Every structure is written in structure tokens, then in C-alpha cells.
Amino acid sequence: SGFRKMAFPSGKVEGCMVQVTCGTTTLNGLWLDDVVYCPRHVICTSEDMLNPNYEDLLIRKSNHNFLVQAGNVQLRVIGHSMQNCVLKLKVDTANPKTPKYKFVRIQPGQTFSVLACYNGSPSGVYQCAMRPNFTIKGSFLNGSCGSVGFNIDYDCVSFCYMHHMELPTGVHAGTDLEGNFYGPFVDRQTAQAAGTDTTITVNVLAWLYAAVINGDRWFLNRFTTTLNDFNLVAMKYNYEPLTQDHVDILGPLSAQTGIAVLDMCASLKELLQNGMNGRTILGSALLEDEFTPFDVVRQCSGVTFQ
């Protein structure tokens, strides 16, 4: 037992990180097969980051303008092109440690592991959620551009996120691996800001179910409610709606606890209104919304990867 914020093992990704240098700017890149992916803003100067025309700035560049280094091994750049917001640098070496992979785009409400990275060297690993407003509350310092987010399905790495920038509130925005941003953000210095966020209701319910499985039952209660009356309360506490599909998805967690899904919503209704009253749940004083039902079924039962 126990419950903790848990990432996938990062070794399969660690074998794909490189550093890309163009001009005076050094960032991270992702090396799969014979291609290195990285944010396209690596070609930009400081005064280019204002109003850039990236088509214009890229035709002014060469194969040799780009330096790639995989640890203590230098890669020859043999081609370059822009796909949406990323640069895609053909190198003369197919990564000998290329895993099975996919490029998927995730939904807000889903989670992923991040491998934060500096000068092509992995520094740390941690779990994240895609916020309803398409930001992520990460930990990234200067030089972490190009660090990726990923999920692992037995032996297959689903890359889902590439880091691009930090917004005013200290949160981060990026793209999927085909270079299309998550949310209404752009790679040119403007006054862009995050936008209003919500709490991910379905995840909170999944985490309450994790706490019952681990022995915190003080917030359980006899009562029930309707899907409709519970949405009246989540609306007023800036929690997103719950659907019959969210209910059907919680089914397996309901049948292991014997707590009908609507019964747990009545619990959540009271937590929202009465607070937690000096107690905690899974060592937290907060209703935690960054675990999905799948995450719970992962830790509170058992699935490994290869």
C-alpha cells in the first residue's frame, strides 16, 4: 500500500536526449531514428523573439549552423525543416537506442511524466497533469527548452509534450511532438497569460477512491445524490462537470470499494462545503486532482513496463 506522485521510469527517454546549439542559444532535443526534434525558437536571437517570421529566419540558416551533441559524441546535421512549431534536424546517425514510440496528443485531465533537461543531460523526473487551460505546473529553469513529456505502455513510449516557455504566473506552455501548441500560446514574446483554470473532478473522485483503498475513510458517509444535483455544487466550486462516461470509468474503482460512484460524489459535495476540518487525506490537506482513474488502478493494483 501507500500512495505517491509517481512517474514512469525514464531510461527509455534518457537515451534520446541531446543538446542543440544554434548561435548563442543552447537547448535540448529529442533524437529518434535519424531526426532531432527541438523548439523552433532555437534559431532566434534575443531581438528575433519579438516579432519573428520563422520561415524567413530558417531559410537564412544552413546545415552547419546547427550543432548537435549526444553526450560526448557529435552528430552531423544533414537536413533541417520546420513542422509547425518545432525544428526537425536530420542527422547522419539513427539513435542506436531508439525505443518503440508513438506521437500522441493528450487531453486536459490526463497525466504524464516529464524528464527535465539541461545541455542534453537529464536532471530530474516528475509526474504532471495537463491543466484544463492547457498549461502545466512544472519545474523548469532557463535551458530546459526541449524537455519532453511521455507515457509508457508496456514497452512503448507515447511522447506527448515538448516544453517551450514559462508564462507570467510561473506555469509552462508547450506543444505536442508534431509542433502544435497545447492551448492558445505562441513562440514570440507577447503579454500572453494562462487563462482561468478548473479542478479536474473525475480525478479527485479517483483519488478519494485511492484513499479508501489505503485506509482513510473519515470522509465517507451514508448519503447519496444525483449526477445533476452534484453538478450544481461543482459548478459553484469551479469544478468541471461530471459525465455518465466519467461515472462508467469509475466503475471498477466502485466495485473494489463497494462505494457507489454517486455515493462518493456526496462525500465530495461535503468536503467542498464543510472543508476538511483539520484532517488530511493521503498525507494531503488538499483535494488532489492530478491522478486519473488509470493512475489509481496502476499504483493501487499493479502494472509494470518493459
For residues 163 to 182, the per-residue mask of contacts with its own copies, x marking binding by CB under 8 A and - elsewhere, is ---x---xxx----------
Give backbone dihedrals phi and psi of 159, rounded to 5 degrees, phi first.
-75, 130
Rounded CA separation 35/95 (Å):
9
93 or 214: CB nearest its own copies: 214
Contact call for residue 116 and ligand A1AS4 (CB under 6 A): no
Rounded CA separation 156/153 (Å):
5
| H/E segment holding residue 80 | strand 77-83
* Helical axes 244-257 vs 261-274, angle rounded to 10°: 100
Rounded CA separation 107/288 (Å):
18
Q: Return the residue of 46, 74, 121, 226 that touches its own copies, per CB under 8 A.
A: 121
List binders of ligand A1AS4 among 150-179 (CB under 6 A).
165-166
List the single partner that 165 binds among ligand A1AS4, its own copies, none, CB under 5 to 8 Å by kind. Answer: ligand A1AS4
Only one of the segments 51-59, 109-117, 175-183, 229-237 lies at the binding site for its own copies (rule: CB under 8 A); that segment is 109-117
120 or 293: CB nearest ligand A1AS4: 120
Q: At a CB cut-off of 8 Å and minimum separation 6, what does 228 contact?
A: none
Only one of the segments 58-66, 141-149, 227-235, 291-299 lies at the binding site for ligand A1AS4 (rule: CB under 6 A); that segment is 141-149
Contact call for residue 119 and its own copies (CB under 8 A): yes
Rounded CA separation 305/58 (Å):
40
For residues 10 to 29, the per-residue mask of contacts with its own copies, x marking binding by CB under 8 A and - elsewhere, is xxx-xx--------------
Q: Return the residue of 140, 150, 182, 291 that touches its own copies, per CB under 8 A.
A: 140
Rounded CA separation 31/98 (Å):
8
List the single partner that 4 binds among its own copies, ligand A1AS4, none, CB under 5 to 8 Å by kind. Answer: its own copies
Q: At a CB cut-off of 8 Å and minimum separation 6, what does 282 contact?
A: 3, 207, 210, 211, 214, 216, 288
Q: How far apart are the first and last CA of the chain?
A: 23
Instruction: List contacts with its own copies (CB under 8 A).
Output: 1-12, 14-15, 71, 115-119, 121-126, 137-141, 143, 166, 170-172, 214-215, 280, 283-286, 298-299, 301-306
| Residue numbers annotated as active site | 41, 145
